[PDB]
Design an enzyme around this catalytic site. Sequence first.
Site, PDB file in Angstrom:
ATOM      1  N   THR A 236       4.691 -27.216  16.317  1.00 38.49           N
ATOM      2  CA  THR A 236       3.658 -27.304  17.545  1.00 38.49           C
ATOM      3  C   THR A 236       2.599 -26.143  16.987  1.00 38.49           C
ATOM      4  O   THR A 236       2.813 -25.201  16.184  1.00 38.49           O
ATOM      5  CB  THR A 236       4.184 -26.628  18.933  1.00 38.49           C
ATOM      6  OG1 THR A 236       3.183 -26.760  19.549  1.00 38.49           O
ATOM      7  CG2 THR A 236       5.141 -25.347  18.780  1.00 38.49           C
TER       8      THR A 236
ATOM      9  N   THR B 259       0.978  -1.139  -0.115  1.00 41.89           N
ATOM     10  CA  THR B 259       0.079   0.022  -0.100  1.00 41.89           C
ATOM     11  C   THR B 259       0.843   1.212   0.036  1.00 41.89           C
ATOM     12  O   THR B 259       0.341   2.228  -0.580  1.00 41.89           O
ATOM     13  CB  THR B 259      -0.850  -0.195   1.236  1.00 41.89           C
ATOM     14  OG1 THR B 259      -1.674  -1.382   1.072  1.00 41.89           O
ATOM     15  CG2 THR B 259      -1.932   0.912   1.271  1.00 41.89           C
TER      16      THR B 259
ATOM     17  N   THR C 195       1.764  -6.699   3.588  1.00 41.50           N
ATOM     18  CA  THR C 195       2.075  -7.344   4.656  1.00 41.50           C
ATOM     19  C   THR C 195       1.298  -8.813   4.792  1.00 41.50           C
ATOM     20  O   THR C 195       1.843  -9.749   5.561  1.00 41.50           O
ATOM     21  CB  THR C 195       1.461  -6.692   5.890  1.00 41.50           C
ATOM     22  OG1 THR C 195       0.131  -6.602   5.408  1.00 41.50           O
ATOM     23  CG2 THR C 195       1.906  -5.334   6.033  1.00 41.50           C
ATOM     24  N   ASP C 196       0.601  -9.353   3.902  1.00 38.25           N
ATOM     25  CA  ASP C 196      -0.216 -10.567   3.889  1.00 38.25           C
ATOM     26  C   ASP C 196       1.004 -11.846   3.985  1.00 38.25           C
ATOM     27  O   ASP C 196       0.599 -12.797   4.727  1.00 38.25           O
ATOM     28  CB  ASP C 196      -0.990 -10.812   2.888  1.00 38.25           C
ATOM     29  CG  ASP C 196      -2.505 -10.299   2.853  1.00 38.25           C
ATOM     30  OD1 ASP C 196      -2.664  -9.676   4.261  1.00 38.25           O
ATOM     31  OD2 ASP C 196      -3.321 -10.340   2.268  1.00 38.25           O
TER      32      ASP C 196
ATOM     33  N   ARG D 147       0.925 -29.851  12.152  1.00 40.02           N
ATOM     34  CA  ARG D 147       0.891 -29.091  13.481  1.00 40.02           C
ATOM     35  C   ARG D 147       0.478 -29.792  14.620  1.00 40.02           C
ATOM     36  O   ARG D 147      -0.752 -30.154  14.460  1.00 40.02           O
ATOM     37  CB  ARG D 147       0.145 -27.771  13.202  1.00 40.02           C
ATOM     38  CG  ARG D 147       0.979 -27.061  11.913  1.00 40.02           C
ATOM     39  CD  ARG D 147       0.151 -25.799  11.592  1.00 40.02           C
ATOM     40  NE  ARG D 147       0.207 -24.656  12.572  1.00 40.02           N
ATOM     41  CZ  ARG D 147      -0.749 -24.253  13.369  1.00 40.02           C
ATOM     42  NH1 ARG D 147      -1.858 -25.023  13.374  1.00 40.02           N
ATOM     43  NH2 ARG D 147      -0.396 -23.250  14.183  1.00 40.02           N
TER      44      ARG D 147
ATOM     45  N   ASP E 116       0.693  -8.017  -5.311  1.00 41.89           N
ATOM     46  CA  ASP E 116      -0.374  -8.034  -4.111  1.00 41.89           C
ATOM     47  C   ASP E 116       0.119  -9.183  -3.381  1.00 41.89           C
ATOM     48  O   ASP E 116       0.173 -10.524  -4.002  1.00 41.89           O
ATOM     49  CB  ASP E 116      -1.922  -8.407  -4.519  1.00 41.89           C
ATOM     50  CG  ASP E 116      -2.661  -8.471  -3.182  1.00 41.89           C
ATOM     51  OD1 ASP E 116      -2.390  -8.882  -2.277  1.00 41.89           O
ATOM     52  OD2 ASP E 116      -3.902  -8.151  -3.168  1.00 41.89           O
ATOM     53  N   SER E 117       0.732  -9.083  -2.072  1.00 43.41           N
ATOM     54  CA  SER E 117       1.548  -9.889  -1.502  1.00 43.41           C
ATOM     55  C   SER E 117       0.694 -11.446  -1.331  1.00 43.41           C
ATOM     56  O   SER E 117       1.261 -12.595  -1.235  1.00 43.41           O
ATOM     57  CB  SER E 117       2.026  -9.713  -0.208  1.00 43.41           C
ATOM     58  OG  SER E 117       1.336  -9.908   0.953  1.00 43.41           O
ATOM     59  N   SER E 118      -0.761 -11.402  -1.177  1.00 46.13           N
ATOM     60  CA  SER E 118      -1.458 -12.692  -1.244  1.00 46.13           C
ATOM     61  C   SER E 118      -1.327 -13.423  -2.603  1.00 46.13           C
ATOM     62  O   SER E 118      -1.704 -14.634  -2.424  1.00 46.13           O
ATOM     63  CB  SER E 118      -2.942 -12.387  -0.928  1.00 46.13           C
ATOM     64  OG  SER E 118      -3.511 -11.478  -1.955  1.00 46.13           O
TER      65      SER E 118
END
Lengths: 329, 322
Positions: free
Chosen positions: B256, B13, B90-91, B225, B58-60
């Site tokens: 974990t 952004t 940020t994604d 996980r 777009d980081s996604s």
Amino acid sequence: KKSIYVAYTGGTIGMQRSDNGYIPVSGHLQRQLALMPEFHRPEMPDFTIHEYAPLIDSSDMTPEDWQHIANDIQQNYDLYDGFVILHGTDTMAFTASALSFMLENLAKPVIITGSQIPLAEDASDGQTNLLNALYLAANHPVNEVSLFFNNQLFRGNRTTKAHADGFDAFASPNLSVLLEAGIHIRSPTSNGPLIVHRITPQPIGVVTIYPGISGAVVRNFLLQPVKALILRSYGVGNAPQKAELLDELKNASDRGIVVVNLTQSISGSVNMGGYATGNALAQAGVISGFDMTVEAALTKLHYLLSQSLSPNEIRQLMQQNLRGELTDT
Amino acid sequence: QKKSIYVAYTGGTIGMQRSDNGYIPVSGHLQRQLALMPEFHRPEMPDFTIHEYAPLIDSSDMTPEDWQHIANDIQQNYDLYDGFVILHGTDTMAFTASALSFMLENLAKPVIITGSQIPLAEDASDGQTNLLNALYLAANHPVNEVSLFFNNQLFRGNRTTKAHADGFDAFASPNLSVLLEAGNGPLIVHRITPQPIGVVTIYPGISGAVVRNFLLQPVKALILRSYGVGNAPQKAELLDELKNASDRGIVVVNLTQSISGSVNMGGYATGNALAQAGVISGFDMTVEAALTKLHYLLSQSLSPNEIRQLMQQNLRGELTDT
């Protein structure tokens, strides 16, 4: 004098330390508590311990064990003022979440707790955890399934085991604690009789998105016998703009698979309202899991899939706050 | 004469314009704004060059191919600058930071990934403070690692995860202290390609049948996980499927579910049934580190046993010995 029912289902709290690890000793919890005078002060409730035989390591819990605990509460509901469940820490948050859905119109406290250390040891919180759970199940008017750990009472269906071990192992990342019992910092329906829902194991995939994730890998996650998929996505609920992924999710939803979007983030919400989002996930039939924990979404899907509901009926109820597990965006 | 920092505006952004139709790209907007903001040109601030990617990502929508483009961009600029700031959405910022840590071996200059969820211009925007701070630190307090900077904290990149779904305090390093509270051999750039990895979460009563489908072709590795310090149900129905997968060369890694703390299952020194099924410990790795590390190792010419060994070794600061 209040009366509390305690189910010792499992956990290290009542065990003995040995070279060969913690070992169960029949009656050891009850013998020790008889000799700990804090438990028998005038302000403390009377309590009755039902020790499971065998004790269950919580890593071996199944939905049948959820049902056994719920049935134990239902059997005893009119005979006591409240309930304490003693349980291993590994899946305590799953059991708390499941019981919140299973015990509809709950109008007495149910408090789950435990300890990773035998309660006679100085490093154990088991004495303070059980003392507070007994006192609060008797005196605190929160008629919900709660989890008590590190001097905090959390809403059960908002809890996750946030640290791998240690005295502060639980958090409620998307809801304030219900109560602080030590150091201080500066509600669901019970109208109508207790209803104890039946739950059975359900074939659910819980998967994490990552850059480049293939349609082929996701297709495998959605093969029979899966009936529902929890997708852990980025930020406020974003996934790649990738036709090969969206096509597999849409094919699954079109054949009645319930696909639920949770954030990979510790805290915060998916923001993907079904009629009011450009998210390509929503167009592929994925629904929002808002700010649910994995524990809440996984147990809520067990609860809804175990009843006689259609896919569309499940999708609607997954998005509705049923027991305090999720916050409207 | 001043330090010189290369800034790759890959996406996010920071350099965009807010619009009714959400944020829109404006070519050259970031560079124009920074030329007019005096704080960027004070004595302690390095000289910097902006390179704006076209298109912005777009980081996604990031893929491993985009990891490679950013690594290659750093390699081509490596000798021309004293340090590198990567602006990114940020994604998936933590996945890119993790991947670049493995790809850039013998890194001996600072790489700092950062970004903002608000345009640089906007009042009390972290665009200005995140980029200004990253440029300041790359020049004046260099750490010769891939670091992620956000909200006055410099984290080790391969120890970062997105804490909050949005907001100013988006990132954490749950298993390693911040490199900074801000209130041998030449560079080798490894190739990474997409790898078929399953990342799954166990739960009470999880079936053999569901686990069996996680391990079907083309899966080469599975991140499992599990509970607490790395515990799973003792039932043969689960462990048999994991053992069959490992026996055909699938690398199965135990992480974990807890946001903090470590799996405790050393390979030679564990009563874990999982270890008998061929499962290896991922110690205290983040999902981002484990997933990018598997990409890194599967992208070379290593056998399953070689990958299993290297997955349990601290290669770039991503995991702590128990």
